[PDB]
Amino acid sequence: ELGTSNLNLDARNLLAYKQTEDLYHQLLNYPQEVISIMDQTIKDCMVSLIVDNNLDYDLDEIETKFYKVRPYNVGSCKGMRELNPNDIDKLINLKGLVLRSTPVIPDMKVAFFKCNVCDHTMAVEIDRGVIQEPARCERIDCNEPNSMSLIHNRCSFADKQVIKLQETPDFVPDGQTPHSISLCVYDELVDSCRAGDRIEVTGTFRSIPIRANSRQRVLKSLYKTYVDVVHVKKVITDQDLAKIREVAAREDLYSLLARSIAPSIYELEDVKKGILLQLFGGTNKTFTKGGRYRGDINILLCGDPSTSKSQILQYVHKITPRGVYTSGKGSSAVGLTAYITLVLESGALVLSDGGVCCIDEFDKMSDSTRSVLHEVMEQQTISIAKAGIITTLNARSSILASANPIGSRYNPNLPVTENIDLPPPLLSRFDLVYLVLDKVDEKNDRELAKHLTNLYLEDKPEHISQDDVLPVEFLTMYISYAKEHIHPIITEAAKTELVRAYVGMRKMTATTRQLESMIRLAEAHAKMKLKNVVELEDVQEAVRLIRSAIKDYATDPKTGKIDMNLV
C-alpha cells in the first residue's frame, strides 16, 4: 500500500522460530544463493496475498517490480585487520567511519544487438561480466555470420558506487595508524552516505584476481579483496511523545538537563547551562531579500589550568550527532577549511556542518591560522579562489573553544581583555565568554576531594555525582525532537525588554553583536521548554547568563580588573 520494494530482516528471528534454526547458519555460509531464494519467496507471497484475498491491486504491477530482502544484526562485529582467507564469500559485519565516495558509475545489465543487413534485433542477458554475442543472425532467411552488432545507448544499465571506509581508533594496534577497506554498493543505497559519517554495515567479503597487463589474460597470484554490502545502519512512538511532554512539565527541568549532559563533572553549573543552550541553538531565518541570519552559538572557555575544561569538551564531542575534536598545534588553515588536491576536498569545519566543532589549546595556534575563522563564524560560508577552482561553500558549524590566559595562569593585576589577549575582531564573534578560576577554599576543596576519591572505591564505578539524571539516549531524543518540531517567535513584550536591556548595557563596551546574541540565546531557551513564543522570562535568562559568564558583577567598572575576594 506504500508502493515500496525492500524488507528489513534482523537475523535473530530465524533462531526464534523452530523450523529456521538451521537456515540461520546456511545464510552465513551461503549468502548468494540463500538471499536469492528469499527474494523469490517474498515476491510470490506478495502475489499470493492479492490473489487469495482477491483484492483490487494490479497483478501486472506487482509482477513488474523487483523485491529484495536486506538481512542485518547477523552477529558479532569483526575487526578489519582480522579478516582471513577462510572468510571468503561468507557474511561479515563492520563498524567504521566514512572517508569519501566516488561518483556513480554506470554498470551494464542487458545488451542490445541489431543486424547490419536485415535489421533484426535481439536483447541479451549479461552474467559473470561476459556478453554472450550470437554467432550468426538468428532470422531464418538471413542466417549469416558476423551479421549482428551492438548499440550502446539502447542497452540497459544500473548504478554502482564505491565507498571508502576507515578503521575506528578503538581497534588500532599499539604504536600504529588506522587502515581502510573499500565497499561496493548498488541501486537503492547508492548516494546514502557522506564524508565524516559513522556507520555499521553488513555484506559478503569477496576476493577477485587482477590482470598483469591490459593486452592478455595473464593474472597475478595475489587477489584483490573488498566488501559487497547488502545493508547499512547508522550507529516516533506515542510513548516517546508522552515521555517527552511529561518530562517537559517538570519544575526542575533546566537544572535537570544541564547537570545531565556531563554527569561525573563536579559543579560548573553555568558552563553546563551555556553548553546546553548551544546544543539547542537559535532559529534559522531567511528573507526574500536582506539575507539569512545564523541560529548557531559560539562559546569560549578561558581560565586557569587543571580546571577540567578539556574534560567537558569530551562530553560535547560524544553527545553531538555530528562534530569534530581537534587541537591548536594540530591544525593548518587548509586542514581546518578545505584542500586543493584537479579536485576540492573537505576540512574540519566542513565535515562538522550542522554540528559542533571542538577546538582545544586555542591559544597555541598562530594569528595566520586563527584569521581563517573570521569569515566562517560571521557568515557561516567559506569562499575560495585558487588556481582552477573558485566557489563558496556552506558551514553551519558551532564552535566550542578552550584556552589558557597569557602567562598561563590568570593574573589579577591586568585587565580582563589583556589576560584573554585575543584581538578584538575575533573576541567580538563569540556569543559567550567564560572565566573559570582556580580559587582556593577549604569548603570547596573538601567536596572536590571527596568526589574524586569516591571513584576509586570500586573497580568499575557505579557511583555518580547526583541522584536524578536522564540517560544519554533519552536526553538525545529530547534535544533532537525539540530541534526538529519547535520554532519560537519574538513577542512584543520580548521586543521591549530586549531594547531596554541593550540600552542598559550600552549606556555607560557592548557592541551591536550583544543584541543579536541575546536574541539567539533567548530563542534557544524557548525551544528547551517546547514553547512556540519567546517571552520576558526567556529574555531575562539570556541577559543573566551573559552577565554571569564574564564575572561582570566582580569587575571594577572603571579599571577593568577583577576583585578576587568577590569570586
Partner: protein, 364 residues
C-alpha cells in the same frame, strides 16, 4: 533483481545420481529455465537447405505483411481510378487479352505468364472484398473471369508450369487458380457454374491439386502458404457439392502433414488467420476422419509447448482458444492409446512403419 556478478552456482542431480552445473540466480528457482539454458550452451546446429529468380519484386518472393503509404488525397484518387477501371474496363480488357493468349500460348515468355496471373488475381479479389463490404458494388463487374476459355487458360498455364518444374510460374498459377475457386463459391451462394465445377474437378485435376502440398515442404515460406489456402478452398467447395470420401482419403498421408507442421512452427511471423486454417485441417484429420495415428509424432508435441507457453501466442488472442481446445483432446486420446499398448513410447520418435503384417494393427 540483483546484479550480474552477485550470482551463485547451481548443481542439478539426475536419476542415477549424476550431476550437472549451471550458473545464474534465476536457475536456482526455475527448472524450466535451467533445462532450457542447459541445452542452449551447446555449440552445433545442423546446416540447412534452400527457388525463384529473374523478375521484379512482387507477391511471389516477398513478405506482403508490409503496406505502402498514402496521402488522403492519394488514397481517394487511387480508389477512384481503379474503381472506375473495374466498373468500366476490366471485362473488355480480359476478354481481349485472353483470346489472344489461347492462340499464342506456345510462344510465351515467363514474364507475360506471371503478369497475366497476377492481374487476374488482384482485380477478382478486390471486387469480392468491395461487394462483401457494400451493396452498391456488385459481382457482375468481374464476371468475365468465369467463362470457359479463361478457365481453360489458367488451367493450362498451371499444368504446363508444373510439368516442366518451373516453380515461379507454378507459384503464380497457384494464386490465380485459388481466386477462381473463391469466386465460384461466391456465385453458388446466390446454372453453367456447376458445369464449370464438374469440368474443374475431373479426376486428372484432383490428381494435380492433391499432389501440390506434398512438394511444398522444401520451398520458401510463401509457397507453403499458397498451398494451404488453396487446399482450404478446394476441400470446402467439394464439401458443399453435397465422391467426397475418395477425395479426402487422397489428401491424408505423411508428406502433407510434414508440410503443415514445417509451416506451422514459424508462427511468430504469420497472421492470426493462417493458424485458424491449419487447425481447421487438424480438426479434419484428427476428429472427423479419425486417422489419429498421423499426429503421434514428437516434433508436433514440442511445438504445442512452445506456442502454448507464456512464451508465444498471446494470452488473449483468439488463437489460444483453438490451440488449448485442440491439445486437451489430443492428450486425452494419447493417454488412452499409450496405456492400451505400451509399444508406442518407442513409436513416438519415429515415422510409422509400413510393414503389412504388423502395420495394420500399428495404425489402429
Amino acid at each position: 533483481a540483483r546484479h550480474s556478478r552477485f550470482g551463485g552456482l547451481l548443481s542439478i542431480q539426475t536419476p542415477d545420481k549424476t550431476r550437472l552445473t549451471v550458473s545464474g540466480s534465476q536457475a536456482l528457482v526455475d527448472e524450466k529455465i535451467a533445462l532450457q539454458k542447459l541445452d542452449d550452451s551447446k555449440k552445433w546446429n545442423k546446416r540447412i537447405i534452400k527457388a525463384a529468380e529473374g523478375l521484379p519484386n512482387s507477391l511471389l518472393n516477398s513478405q506482403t505483411g508490409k503496406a505502402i503509404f498514402f496521402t488522403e488525397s492519394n488514397g481517394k484518387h487511387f480508389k477512384e481510378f481503379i474503381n472506375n477501371f473495374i466498373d468500366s474496363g476490366f471485362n473488355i480488357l480480359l476478354h481481349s487479352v485472353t483470346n489472344y493468349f489461347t492462340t499464342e500460348q506456345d510462344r510465351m515468355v515467363t514474364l507475360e505468364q506471371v503478369e497475366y496471373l497476377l492481374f487476374f488475381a488482384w482485380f477478382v479479389k478486390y471486387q469480392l472484398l468491395r461487394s462483401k463490404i457494400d451493396n452498391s458494388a456488385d459481382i457482375k463487374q468481374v464476371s468475365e473471369a468465369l467463362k470457359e476459355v479463361t478457365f481453360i487458360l489458367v488451367s493450362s498455364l498451371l499444368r504446363s508450369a508444373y510439368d516442366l518444374k518451373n516453380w515461379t510460374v507454378t507459384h503464380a498459377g497457384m494464386i490465380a487458380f485459388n481466386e477462381l475457386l473463391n469466386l465460384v463459391s461466391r456465385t453458388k451462394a446466390a446454372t453453367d457454374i456447376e458445369f464449370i465445377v464438374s469440368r474443374l474437378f475431373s479426376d486428372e485435376r484432383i490428381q494435380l491439386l492433391s499432389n501440390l502440398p506434398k512438394i511444398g515442404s522444401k520451398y520458401s515460406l510463401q509457397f507453403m502458404k499458397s498451398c494451404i489456402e488453396l487446399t482450404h478452398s478446394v476441400l470446402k467447395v467439394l464439401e458443399q457439392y453435397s465422391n467426397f470420401q475418395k477425395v479426402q482419403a487422397n489428401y491424408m498421408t505423411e508428406p502433407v502433414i510434414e508440410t503443415y507442421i514445417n509451416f506451422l512452427e514459424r508462427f511468430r511471423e504469420l497472421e492470426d488467420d493462417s493458424i485458424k486454417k491449419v487447425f481447421s485441417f487438424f480438426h479434419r484429420v484428427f476428429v472427423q476422419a479419425k486417422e489419429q495415428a498421423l499426429l503421434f509424432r514428437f516434433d508436433l508435441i514440442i511445438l504445442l509447448r512452445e506456442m502454448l507457453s507464456p512464451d508465444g501466442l498471446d494470452r488473449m488472442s483468439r488463437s489460444r482458444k483453438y490451440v488449448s481446445q485442440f491439445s486437451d483432446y489430443f492428450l486425452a486420446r494419447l493417454k488412452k492409446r499409450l496405456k492400451k499398448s505400451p509399444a508406442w513410447f518407442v513409436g513416438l520418435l519415429f515415422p510409422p512403419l509400413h510393414n503389412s503384417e504388423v502395420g495394420f494393427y500399428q495404425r489402429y
